[PDB]
Amino acid sequence: KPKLHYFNARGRMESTRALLAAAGVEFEEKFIKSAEDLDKLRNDGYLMFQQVPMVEIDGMKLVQTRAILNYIASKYNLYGKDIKERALIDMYIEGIADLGEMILLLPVCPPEEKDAKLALIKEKIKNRYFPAFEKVLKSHGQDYLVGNKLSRADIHLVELLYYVEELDSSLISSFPLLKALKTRISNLPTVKKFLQPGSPRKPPMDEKSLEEARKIFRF
Amino acid sequence: AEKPKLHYFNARGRMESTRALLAAAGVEFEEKFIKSAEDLDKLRNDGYLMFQQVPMVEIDGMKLVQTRAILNYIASKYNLYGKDIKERALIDMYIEGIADLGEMILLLPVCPPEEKDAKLALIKEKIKNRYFPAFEKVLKSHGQDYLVGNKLSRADIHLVELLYYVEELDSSLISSFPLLKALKTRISNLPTVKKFLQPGSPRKPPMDEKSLEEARKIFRF
Ligand SMILES: CCCCCCSC[C@H](NC(=O)CC[C@H]([NH3+])C(=O)O)C(=O)NCC(=O)O
Ligand SMILES: CCCCCCSC[C@H](NC(=O)CC[C@H]([NH3+])C(=O)O)C(=O)NCC(=O)O
Secondary structure (H helix, E strand, O other): OOEEEEEOOOOOOHHHHHHHHHOOOOOEEEEEOOHHHHHHHHHOOOOOOOOOOEEEEOOEEEEOHHHHHHHHHHHOOOOOOOHHHHHHHHHHHHHHHHHHHHHHOHHHOOHHHHHHHHHHHHHHHHHHHHHHHHHHHHHHOOOOOOOOOOOHHHHHHHHHHHHHHHHOOOHHHHOHHHHHHHHHHHHOHHHHHHHOOOOOOOOOOOHHHHHHHHHHOOO | OOOOEEEEOOOOOOOHHHHHHHHHOOOOOEEEEOOOHHHHHHHHHOOOOOOOOOOEEEEOOEEEEOHHHHHHHHHHHOOOOOOOHHHHHHHHHHHHHHHHHHHHHHOHHHOOOOOHHHHHHHHHHHHHHHHHHHHHHHHHHHOOOOOOOOOOOHHHHHHHHHHHHHHHHOOOOHHHOHHHHHHHHHHHHOHHHHHHHOOOOOOOOOOOHHHHHHHHHHHOO
């Protein structure tokens, strides 16, 4: 069983949790609670650049989010059939990541910039990203983004749509193919089970999770 | 068929790492220099940019946008991404740390003037105390000429590229890392990297104030 080192929160670990779950892979979590808990991992030599996420899998101590996901994805045949496929898959998920990152960091944002940035994210969603993934689906009219078959692109995209729904339920409304993907994916039995209460799925980060984060990561 | 074609402004930015990867692999490419807000708008209205942004590279029938999507493709094609899934893990771990420090250096110019000093002081701390030791430790782990699999890889090329920008910022920084020093000399001497380094190659100057202005007009920031 792979073993995930992170604090109890979404952060930069959630796309790994959701991709393990979708692959039907069972896993352990070791939760950092304090800054003493992080420093213990550092000291023990466990963290290449002294940072989490880290995952123990197949005898490596794999740090860096993209290093973790690229590996999980090949292992479980969620990374396409060849390097042209990987290429489309990579173009899509990096664009997802780019929006992902704007959402992820919105609460560590200085208070006086908060309104501006939320506004910009919504416009980007409406004008940049959703039209881009709607035009891919419409292009081929298939059930999956790439290769008429399940990949990490579907998993990362649908994950992200849940996060946008929590922001504004109106945003997706003029994107019918995006809605239809959301449903179909959320109905795959492994994804359905992750979305169910009681799973490892993590909630949005409230104020006191943010505070525990400033404590442990010292920002 | 077709040389690859690179769409960017005339500057390092986010295109440079691709320039250095393709030339290291001995791969010739064309370059089309974006020079104005209107030039960018043309490529948007022609349907050329998946997210309306550059870098974009035409290669093998594709219009690849996103640095990492372009680099992963080029690396794979010319056998610079290890020999298996496990080698590809170690490569990605290393080159994502390089990207992290890489990002810090790139966005240095667009800092507010009052924070510039604190944020140079901080780059410098992490280099000395986090990033340089981690790479030195790897090289010392196996005593081998390359970072991964004792065979030339994209991590070697990205680390050495970055080794150059750490030097234009401060020469004293790499000077307590003998193994990083040695790697830099070695890779710089391979025939294709040597030919990227010499005058008149597509290799780009450090970004200046003027060029920070043209970036502002073009990308509208
Ligand atoms: C609003 C959510 C914020 C949650 C906290 C940030 S994630 C914790 C942070 N880790 C990273 O920033 C890792 C970045 C790395 N590039 C990756 O993607 O894995 C860390 O250990 N930082 C500690 C350090 O740098 O010492
Ligand atoms: C200060 C010197 C560095 C200049 C950086 C600007 S690069 C231009 C920028 N492109 C991106 O940031 C794409 C990022 C993307 N994730 C990638 O890595 O390719 C852009 O098209 N901007 C236009 C837009 O997003 O609207």
